[PDB]
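Students often ask why we bother predicting the structure of a whole assembly rather than each chain alone. The short answer is interfaces. A chain on its own may look different once its partners are present, and contacts between molecules only exist in the joint model. In this exercise we take two input lines together and write out one structure for the complete complex. Read the inputs first and try to guess which parts will touch.
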Amino acid sequence: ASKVKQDMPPPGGYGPIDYKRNLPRRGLSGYSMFAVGIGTLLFGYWSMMKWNRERRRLQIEDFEARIALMP
Amino acid sequence: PGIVELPTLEDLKVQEVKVSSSVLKAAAHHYGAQCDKPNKEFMLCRWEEKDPRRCLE
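Now the answer. The structure tokens for the assembled complex follow.
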């Protein structure tokens, strides 16, 4: 006596279902990456230049200590 | 071929310096500043004679 009941889609329809490819760009330019790399290299070069010059001075100092102690 | 002459053990005695390497390294700069003359004389004797038996004094 009751209404026919069955598994049916809701009145209207269903919400849209996405299927298309979605790969966002999500990246920097090539120039920016290359510039960051070159700047990092230059900073490291300058720091290591100072450090190695100081190390050469220290090495000369201890070599002179040896020279003084040798006789 | 000849007999090698060597100094006697008495002539090889001296008041020894019995401080370690760290003490010597800590004092080295002032030691070479102050005691330059005898050390340089000894080295000149050493590289001119080429014989340890000739530079004991």
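Check your guess against this: Chain A touches chain B through seven residues (CB under 8 Å).
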